[PDB]
Design a protein around this ligand. Sequence first.
Ligand SMILES: O=C(O)[C@H]1O[C@@H](O)[C@H](O)[C@@H](O)[C@H]1O
Ligand SMILES: [Cl-]
Ligand SMILES: [Cl-]
Length: 298
Amino acid sequence: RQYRSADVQPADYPTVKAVQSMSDELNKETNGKISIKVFPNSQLGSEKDTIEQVKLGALDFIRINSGTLNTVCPAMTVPVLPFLFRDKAHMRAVLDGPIGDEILADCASHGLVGLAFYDSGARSFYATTPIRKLEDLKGKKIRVQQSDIWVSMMKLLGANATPMPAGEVFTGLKSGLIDGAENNWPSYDNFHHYEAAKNYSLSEHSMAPEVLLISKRVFDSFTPEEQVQVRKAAKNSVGYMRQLWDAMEISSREKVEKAGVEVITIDKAPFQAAVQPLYDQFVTDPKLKDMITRIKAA
Ligand SMILES: O=C(O)[C@H]1O[C@@H](O)[C@H](O)[C@@H](O)[C@H]1O
Ligand SMILES: [Cl-]
Ligand SMILES: [Cl-]
């Protein structure tokens, strides 16, 4: 059985290679019984639409950002929150441990089994003009993921959110529909956004990680041994992914700088102050508020 998985990222991207590595492991351990074919580059649809396919059992696996998954699974809002993690090492420790496992377990009741977190760096603003301070964002049309938290966030920052699928963003930057967007270094590179919006400002305002999930309907068809094998292959793929990822952050930043991008250092304090209301607005469950307390102290 060759199961199917979706990713908006290109064929050679670390998230795609990670799931392919998981497939290789499963193919070996199950002696051909289970493998996974990845369909990259939004071939199967947007993140919004592919998450619905998984809920319906129309799609077996999905690799999506938590910043869209949190439309369905409330716990996924927690790791999206701006300025929550101190740095990459803090995030990795949290997501690899009990807190990460607790968040992944939240998805099952919604028809999706959470299997692993993949790194996504920190998301930063980029635009067709240089954003040198928060005030420079005022009135700008900034694309966000199709998830309400980001609309609220842009409002607090004085910008105008335009939610749209990942595959439409380059076109919007070239057409004038949007003035900018926000993402990590490998995405700024690999979606070609740097060609159209040549000013990248290190706001580092979210570390929203990626999530790999399986349809609950499909998972439930697996033997108990197969379920253990799938979870273990998913966890093993995190370390594989991270090695590819850390190199790509370097090579992508180098590539776009060579192409003429201005990399802008920006005072984050006004951003942090502006977005604080999001925490109580979007995280209302006492269990999740306690989780945030534990994360802040980890
Ligand atoms: O902004 C987006 O649409 C994209 O951002 C990337 O960082 C993430 O890897 C994609 O899964 C998608 O969420
Ligand atoms: Cl300012
Ligand atoms: Cl999308």
